[PDB]
């Protein structure tokens with residue numbers, strides 16, 4: 203009843219209660235959405251050439267007995283997701299010394315799946331996906347010290363109580379390309395927690411390319427203690443989007459915006475990109491980013507930013523890209539973008555902007571891309587763009603441009619001379635003609 | 646090469662369970678099996694599959710599809726199996742399956758289909774398995790007459806392998822078999 207196409211066997215939703223007879227040469231088999239209640243050593247006896255196997259989403263309670271995969275020395279990818287109440291014997295993965303990818307998302311598994319010997323046979327494991335289980339503590343057993351190519355771990359949507367040095371002892375020495383700790387709550391790691399000093403550095407002797415800590419609240423007082431704790435950890439990309447407790451929010455008193463101490467622990471981390479989007483930052487305070495001395499890209503999109511204080515960007519000597527889209531800046535002035543000499547891309551779209559100050563973009567000689575679209579600009583000051591000598595692209599559309607003369611004289615002429623740079627089309631309010639086409643009778 | 650979010654083996658490309666909001670680009674034209682199940686795909690771009698002329702299996706179950714773009718499958722003349730279960734399909738475009746002469750398995754159960762457009766299955770000469778259960782079929786509407794006439798003529802291939810059979814294609818609210826509705830009981834005015 204399976205559909206066999208070359209080396210592929212598709213057995214999706216066939217009402218199967220056991221592994222069916224298949225040609226012995228197939229290397230990809232999909233057994234998802236069937237009613238297999240148990241896998242044992244006889245299950246894949248006639249399929250030793252397997253490289254890619256999916257047995258997702260059986261009816262609840264799939265049991266995988268010892269040595270089910272013994273003999274599958276060619277198996278590289280094993281996906282077993284959405285098996286509700288998945289039952290694993292401790293030798294379930296015997297023989298999978300060459301496996302590289304294992305996915306066990308939404309299987310009601312707990313922390314013993316990492317601390318027990320389940321993954322002990324998996325010496326070649328590189329990527330482990332454990333999303334949306336019941337893992338309350340991350341405590342890898344000692345055999346992880348010898349898993350030399352293990353570099354991707356996804357624990358998103360597990361309610362992890364806390365992460366501490368002694369928990370992650372057996373990840374020390376590792377370099378993760380991706381450590382995804384998104385929406386894991388960390389409820390115990392609050393500002394009052396007595397465990398902070400004992401917690402030490404969970405990422406001691408550990409480097410990370412992308413650290414995803416999004417969706418975890420990260421109230422300022424918490425972020426500060428957390429980054430103090432992991433100080434010195436080499437992180438190239440830090441993801442902290444949807445930090446719903448981060449920032450003081452729109453007109454409020456409870457929570458605080460980050461300040462010059464909040465991220466001090468990341469001082470020596472070598473962070474290149476930082477994502478703080480979809481949080482609730484209201485004001486950018488002075489030197490709040492001054493410890494990101496290697497940072498090249500920073501997004502603050504979709505916050506509640508109304509204010510940028512003097513020297514908010516102090517110390518950002520390498521920043522090339524700044525995304526401030528979908529905030530509430532309302533008006534731009536010269537002081538606001540000081541200390542950004544190397545900036546090449548600036549996104550100010552969707553900010554309810556009605557005014558640009560005279561020297562707004564003065565200190566940005568290397569700016570290549572400037573987005574000002576979807577605001578409320580009726581006009582700009584004369585000469586506002588003349589010092590942007592590196593400029594390649596500009597967005598000015600979806601603004602209610604006032605095309606009366608001689609008010610529109612500078613902008614219409616500038617947009618015409620620089621027509622190859624304009625992305626989209628700025629339009630006169632009322633008439634709807636391109637601003638670039640207006641020629642004022644005088645100047 | 647294999648798309649970033651995807652895993653490849655032979656002529657198989659599996660992009661399942663990757664929180665995808667759209668179909669990945671750069672899918673090799675040699676692809677015979679494409680898996681996009683268990684993602685957050687909400688819409689398909691018109692002609693997104695035109696490149697994959699060698700596709701025989703397209704798996705799209707457990708996404709957030711509400712409808713399909715017209716002629717989206719017309720290049721896929723070698724398509725054998727098509728999986729659409731657990732989406733939110735409210736309607737199918739006229740003649741989306743017309744080119745699928747070799748299609749043996751069509752899986753449409755657990756969606757939000759009220760009806761099937763006239764002649765939608767007429768070109769499916771190779772059809773062995775079709776699943777249509779768990780849909781709110783509007784039996785008061787007169788457009789259901791095609792589905793009625795078709796499933797009563799091909800009842801052996803409807804919901805087989807203990808999926809209820811032709812009787813598991815049920816009416817919305819009354820839970821009556823669709824094959825048992827009369828033309829007199831239906832009306833063009835009760836069509837939304």
Ligand SMILES: *[C@@H]1O[C@H](CO)[C@@H](O[C@@H]2O[C@H](CO)[C@@H](O)[C@H](O)[C@H]2NC(C)=O)[C@H](O)[C@H]1NC(C)=O
Nearest residue numbers: 267268269290291292293294295296318319320
């Ligand atoms: C499944 O395999 C596990 C591990 O291979 C077995 O547990 C081991 O049994 C030996 C005795 O033969 C003990 O010395 C080890 O300490 C056990 N390991 C653990 C982690 O408990 C287990 O008995 C096997 N179960 C079945 C039903 O065969």
Ligand SMILES: *[C@@H]1O[C@H](CO)[C@@H](O[C@@H]2O[C@H](CO)[C@@H](O)[C@H](O)[C@H]2NC(C)=O)[C@H](O)[C@H]1NC(C)=O
Nearest residue numbers: 479501503504524525526527528547548549573
């Ligand atoms: C700055 O961030 C915003 C939001 O993260 C980016 O917005 C996306 O922009 C593209 C086209 O510009 C849209 O198709 C997407 O829908 C937007 N996403 C959202 C969530 O609104 C924006 O592109 C970023 N700007 C730069 C220059 O990278």
Ligand SMILES: *[C@@H]1O[C@H](CO)[C@@H](O)[C@H](O)[C@H]1NC(C)=O
Nearest residue numbers: 219220240241242243244245
């Ligand atoms: C293995 O599983 C199959 C199907 O579930 C069963 O028929 C067989 O008896 C099992 N064998 C052992 C040794 O458990």
Ligand SMILES: *[C@@H]1O[C@H](CO)[C@@H](O)[C@H](O)[C@H]1NC(C)=O
Nearest residue numbers: 374375376377406407408409
């Ligand atoms: C861990 O420490 C050792 C010894 O100090 C060092 O050689 C190694 O590079 C470190 N590894 C990481 C990933 O930081």
